Amino acid sequence: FRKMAFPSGKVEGCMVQVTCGTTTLNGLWLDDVVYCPRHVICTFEDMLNPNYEDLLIRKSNHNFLVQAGNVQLRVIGHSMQNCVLKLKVDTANPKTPKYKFVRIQPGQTFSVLACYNGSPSGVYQCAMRPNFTIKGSFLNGSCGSVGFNIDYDCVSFCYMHHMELPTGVHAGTDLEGNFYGPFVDRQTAQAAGTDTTITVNVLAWLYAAVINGDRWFLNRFTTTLNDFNLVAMKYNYEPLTQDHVDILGPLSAQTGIAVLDMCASLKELLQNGMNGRTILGSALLEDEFTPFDVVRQC
Amino acid sequence: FRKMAFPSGKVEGCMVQVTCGTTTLNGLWLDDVVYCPRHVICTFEDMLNPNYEDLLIRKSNHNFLVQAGNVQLRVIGHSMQNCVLKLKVDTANPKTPKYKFVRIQPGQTFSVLACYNGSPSGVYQCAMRPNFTIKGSFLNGSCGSVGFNIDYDCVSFCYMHHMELPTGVHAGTDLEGNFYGPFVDRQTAQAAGTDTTITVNVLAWLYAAVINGDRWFLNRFTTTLNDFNLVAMKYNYEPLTQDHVDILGPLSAQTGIAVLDMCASLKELLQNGMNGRTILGSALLEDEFTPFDVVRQCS
Ligand SMILES: *[C@@](O)(CO)[C@H](C[C@@H]1CCNC1=O)NC(=O)[C@H](CC(C)C)NC(=O)c1cc2c(OC)cccc2[nH]1
Ligand SMILES: *[C@@](O)(CO)[C@H](C[C@@H]1CCNC1=O)NC(=O)[C@H](CC(C)C)NC(=O)c1cc2c(OC)cccc2[nH]1
């Protein structure tokens, strides 16, 4: 299995740069609105302790430089929604795809298009951790890069990049400007909560193994969801929700293995370990493939 | 530090579907030419042992159905270059990027745009293995998917997809239609030569691990180039040349770790194992980042 990103072209055509003073970052141009992190209005000194509402009072439409490449897009209005700025521009983007804004859950994967000065640099797949960080790859100038999924040519934007934590993981918002996790957009060292293993994705991995004939681990037992959840947490695994059980539905039907039967198999792996055995060639259980990712690859 | 592909937009605009009889696959549309695997002219019967010149002489321009999304492109000429078919069309692709065809060397990386029915599906990074296979992700209908690098707006196409070996690895050609490796476009079970590990790439990746605050595998030892190469070859690693040592220069300077000092770290990793420890989240020594890849991402 490869970590596979979606083709990035539909998002590349939406990337612009936004500058306010010498502060430059990336923006997302959809129809006649450009979305970007609101801290673009801050000076380095203001990022230490910002009052966004006051900083924005001193800004006008003509303080914002929006560029597609080197071509300036005239700003005709501005407003703030949570931690994102919305700049109304006088040109509707002809490359705007069909799109939606969605807020994802821990465990869901998405493609990140890393950008610098409005220019796309690379694309890779990330998973939202239970502690609401992603293990990204971002340098100075990457803020405003976005994460997305594509379903039948509709682009669902789910992430806009804001911050690197002292541990080197990354934090950001949805496209309505609401952070994932307890983080805030100020220049301070912030720490994430202890992370856990993404149980629903480990189960997807086990289904993937069964699909490919690697099924030694299937056991003879079963469990209730509540009993499994209580054991899972003693091993630093996320509890399952009803939504997790339902997104495992297609793989459960494909293999004939009930979701709760697979939970019982995983519970043995957790208690007894693997015993030098491997699954899909690895001694480690993988937790960054969603049930959808397994269906796409298999 | 993550496996990172090039943005695929410039390539997506070039992907089309090519159909001959009941055989369909993907093609690459640049200016007024569509490039695709030549076995699209074969009926599934044919693939068992094709005589390609003999089969192509018997086809007409109108046997080729080329679709760019919903629009049909009219084929007005065709020619064969090794394992690649070149269909001349009456329409120039307005989204043709600046491009070049290159043949890559083992150990080098490229981005793959996996396509089905002329529609792009996914993008990921691959390396050309020393045995000239690639460890990709390709299903039925993926033939004609391409691999590429991008350098300041210019797309260097280096791979066109043709085959999945029984072991699950993949094989293909350059855009002049010459296979990488000893493979042939006939429907047979084909084995590769014994693979080896790309040593310069593992070293580049260890430099990447240090830049992300993992220095655990480092040691106080040193080694000569030849003594390292003796141990490398014993572990089925490719030899490290002096040119490799020079390519590793910048990473050595940013970290202050001499190349042969890093070789001694790798020697210890090979001789003792990683002991249940992980490097950048991997339980295994990773060999599909080039020194260029590491610099581009870390800097
Ligand atoms: C943006 O590009 C800002 O425009 C930048 C992206 C990061 C730079 C390094 N890699 C990245 O992912 N984001 C920041 O610089 C943010 C700015 C905030 C939201 C105003 N700051 C941080 O990510 C940040 C600050 C501090 C810190 O201070 C004190 C101490 C430790 C970590 C840390 N991260
Ligand atoms: C193409 O899409 C063909 O148009 C297809 C891509 C592979 C299918 C599954 N995954 C892929 O990457 N390529 C093939 O089907 C090729 C066609 C040749 C070049 C004419 N054949 C194989 O990949 C192939 C044939 C055989 C085989 O025979 C008998 C036995 C074992 C493996 C095998 N692979």
Author numbering:
A (entry chain A): 3 to 300
B (entry chain B): 3 to 301
Give verbatim excerpts from the published study on this entry.
The main protease (M pro) of coronaviruses plays a key role in viral replication, thus serving as a hot target for drug design. M pro is able to process polyproteins to produce several nonstructural proteins (NSPs) necessary for viral replication. The recognition site of coronaviral M pro depends on Gln at the P1 position, and no proteases in humans share a similar cleavage site. PF-00835231 is an inhibitor designed for the main protease of SARS-CoV that emerged in 2003, but its clinical trials were suspended due to the rapid disappearance of the SARS outbreak.
